[PDB]
Amino acid sequence: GSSGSSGSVPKRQRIRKLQIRNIPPHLQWEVLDSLLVQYGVVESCEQVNTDSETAVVNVTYSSKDQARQALDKLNGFQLENFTLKVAYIPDEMAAQ
């Protein structure tokens, strides 16, 4: 878009949030974190509830490449007999 902005622009861009499900309620959080960062630089790890037994959380990496791997693996990373499922989360648009 044209250049018509003066000030400190926000940082709500490049948000390829990732959704992870099929997580074992036995594993310890302290463990999950490591698994995340291990892939790349997780900007933030938000919580989510898909109304399912297994635990669900949303991963937000800084770079796209880093995120690609995380999912590329987690998407099917078997953990405690629980095939972790990962899917690219859609961005927030000003439309239905």
Burial group, residue 47, by CB count within 10 angstroms (0-12, 13-18, 19+): exposed
Closest of 74, 90, 80, 72 to residue 16, by C-alpha: 90
86 vs 19: CA distance, rounded Å: 6
Range of the domain at 35: 16-90
* DSSP class of 75: T
10 vs 12: CA distance, rounded Å: 6
Inside any domain, residue 57: yes
Inside any domain, residue 82: yes
Residue 44 sits at φ, ψ, to 5 deg, of: -160, 150
Tell me if residue 74 falls in helix, strand or coil.
Answer: helix
CATH of residue 77? 3.30.70.330
Count of domains in the chain? 1
The residue to which tokens 């992870």 are assigned: 20
- The three-state (H, E, C) secondary structure of 33-73, written as one string: HHHHHHHCCEEEEEEECCCCCCEEEEEEECCHHHHHHHHHH
Inside any domain, residue 54: yes
